[PDB]
Design brief:
By secondary structure, the chain is of the alpha+beta class. 37% of the residues lie in helices and 17% in strands. The protein has eight helices and nine strands. Helix 2 runs antiparallel to helix 7 and helix 3 packs across helix 4. The longest helix has 17 residues.
Length: 267
């Protein structure tokens, strides 16, 4: 039998999680909203901010002010929790491009801090968001304090609608070069830490590019571009907050919301 429409499922899932779910499904070409639930409410970004960060770095590459080959060395003391790539390169350092790849594909936290140093820190990245017309998203702290997710705290938050609009700007507007957009999208295609989320329900032959996040008090989320016939057609942003659910349940609830959108794709 056909499953219920996505909004019916999402309302049910939010009840099961005993928290808030926020999501949007956006047409990539037009920016039209196709599905929305709490899409104007704030949610902690967690590591989903790393797509915006790498976009800001690639804009500096486009301007000739950054080089992906530039080498950065760092200290044991610079390493924050969950740095699976950067903790292996104390002796040899990492290039800016390797740091971007680690930040997106492995969600490496220290890599993101080393890149934040180049774009004016959290305040600088927020100023770049304001420059592209995102008046909502805000980064306030560095890794890992930005994951604190205190209830109601607007620091380090986005809304599903703002994040989707910003991803569309970064990946398809003139704000990044064609080469930079291809590279940002490829890092997201090559995400290695998102298997249990939308990828777990994605039919064969579909395009996927994504970035996950996790934070305190149950915070969890994904940003994704996906579509049939190996072409990106829609942006899907799903955030959870203030839930006591296990990581396994949070992953499967996000996957289930994705499955509902995929099964009801055609309008």
């Amino acid at each position: 039998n056909a499953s219920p429409q996505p909004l019916e499922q999402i309302k049910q899932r939010e009840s099961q999680l005993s928290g808030r779910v926020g999501m949007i499904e956006m047409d990539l070409a037009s920016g039209r909203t196709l599905t929305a639930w709490r899409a104007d409410e704030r949610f902690p970004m967690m590591s989903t901010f790393k797509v915006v960060l790498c976009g800001a770095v690639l804009a500096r590459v486009d301007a000739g002010d950054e080089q992906l080959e530039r080498k950065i060395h760092y200290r044991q003391q610079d390493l924050v929790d969950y740095s699976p790539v950067s903790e292996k390169h104390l002796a040899d350092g990492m290039t800016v491009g390797e740091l971007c790849a680690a930040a997106i594909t492995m969600s490496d936290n220290s890599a993101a801090n080393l890149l934040l140093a180049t774009v004016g820190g959290p305040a600088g990245l927020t100023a770049l968001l304001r420059q592209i017309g995102d008046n909502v998203t805000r980064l306030d702290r560095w890794e890992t304090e930005l994951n604190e997710a205190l209830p109601g705290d607007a620091r380090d938050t986005t809304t599903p609608a703002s994040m989707a609009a910003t991803l569309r700007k970064l990946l398809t507007s003139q704000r990044l070069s064609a080469r930079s957009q291809r590279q940002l999208l490829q890092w997201m295609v090559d995400d290695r830490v998102a298997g249990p989320l939308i990828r777990s329900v994605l039919p064969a032959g579909w395009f996927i590019a994504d970035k996950t996040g996790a934070g305190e008090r149950g915070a969890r989320g994904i940003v994704a571009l996906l579509g049939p016939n190996n072409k990106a057609e829609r942006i899907v942003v799903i955030y959870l907050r203030d839930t006591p659910a296990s990581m396994a349940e949070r992953n499967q609830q996000i996957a289930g919301i994705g499955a509902a959108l995929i099964e009801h794709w055609q309008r």
